[PDB]
Amino acid sequence: MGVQGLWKLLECSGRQVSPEALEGKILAVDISIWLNQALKGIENPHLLTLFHRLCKLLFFRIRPIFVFDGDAPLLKKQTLVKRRQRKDLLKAQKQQQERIAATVTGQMFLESQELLRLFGIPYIQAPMEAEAQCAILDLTDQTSGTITDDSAIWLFGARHVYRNFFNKNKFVEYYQYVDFHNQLGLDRNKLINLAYLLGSDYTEGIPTVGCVTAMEILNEFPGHGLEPLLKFSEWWHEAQKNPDTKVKKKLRTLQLTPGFPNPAVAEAYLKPVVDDSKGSFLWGKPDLDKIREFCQRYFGWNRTKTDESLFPVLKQLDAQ
């Protein structure tokens, strides 16, 4: 999700840790990555995965806050419209394609929230981007960080990220921004400029521009904030207009969108819509009896089958 493979660049800034390290931490959990994965495709396997995942969290005495997406921002809605209409090649025919998609994500929102309530796990509906709201819970010190596999959080200014926390590999990667800012020399603004080139949810990139081509462009036009891309654009708009060899001749062959770099994109990552207010989050003891019913209704699980998974979690919670 987000950018094509920003994770590849950050590999070397990631300490591996044991789930046991996360014990006691308040952590934002991004559920929107799960919702999206499950939207494509045994009955209710999405809920089963959520069920297991919740057990892992509570078993390791993590106090998670689930964050669901609010309204999609303008740039996102626009870039999804261009890109879906670039893949194909009536006006109310796609309006029905978005209405069925909106009920399916609508049920899945409700089903997940039910399960969370039952496990005493608090959730919030972010205003805009969950990732951004998770990022601001991070910055306000309301969480000790975010559990997500979406590299986008970094662009919304996340400090602490736990990645691959739900994997068949089962090595939890812990990243802090501070460590990749010092060890790979990669700041927030550089990561944003990379969005502009590699392409993101807020902007399509430049077609033939990979991790390597992109980094070359930022090293070729050193600057602060958006300056590097502004100089790149100026030079390119000037090495187009006037028809004498130079090292980064590769760039002359690239063809960018007219308004690039549109500062609206940087603005959306830098000053996103979020709830800065200090919230009162609570954590309930899981309603064993109501989870048994849920598992009966959704998985067709007898009590015992539910109990097999649930008890180890509960007994594991009743030590400090």
Residue numbers in the entry: 1 to 41, 50 to 97, 750 to 903, 911 to 987
Copy the relevant paper text.
Nucleotide excision repair (NER) is an essential pathway to remove bulky lesions affecting one strand of DNA. The XP complementation group G (XPG) endonuclease cleaves the damaged DNA strand on the 3′ side of the lesion coordinated with DNA re-synthesis. Here, we report four crystal structures of the human XPG nuclease domain (XPGn) in the absence and presence of DNA. The overall fold exhibits similarities to other flap endonucleases but XPG harbors a dynamic helical arch that is uniquely oriented and defines a gateway.
For crystallization, we introduced the D812A mutation to abolish the XPG nuclease activity. Two versions of the protein were purified that differ in the presence or absence of extra residues at the N-terminus. Both constructs retain the ability to bind splayed-arm DNA and were used to determine two crystal structures of XPGn in the free state, hereafter F1 and F2, with four and two molecules in the asymmetric unit, respectively. Helices α4 and α6 are fully ordered in two F1 molecules, while the N-terminal half of α6 is disordered in the other two F1 molecules. Comparison of F1 molecules where the arch is fully ordered shows that α6 can adopt two distinct conformations by pivoting on its C-terminal end. In the open state, the α4 and α6 backbones lie ∼14 Å apart and define a gap of ∼11 Å, while in the closed state α6 approaches α4 by about 3 Å. This enables weak interactions at the outer rim of the arch, leading to the formation of a pore above the active site with a diameter of ∼9 Å. Arch closure in the DNA-free state correlates with a striking conformational change in the hydrophobic core of the protein. In the open state, residue W34 in α2 sits in a hydrophobic pocket that is sealed by a cation–π interaction with R61 in α3. In contrast, in the closed state, W34 flips into a looser hydrophobic environment and inserts between α3 and α6, which both shift in opposite directions.
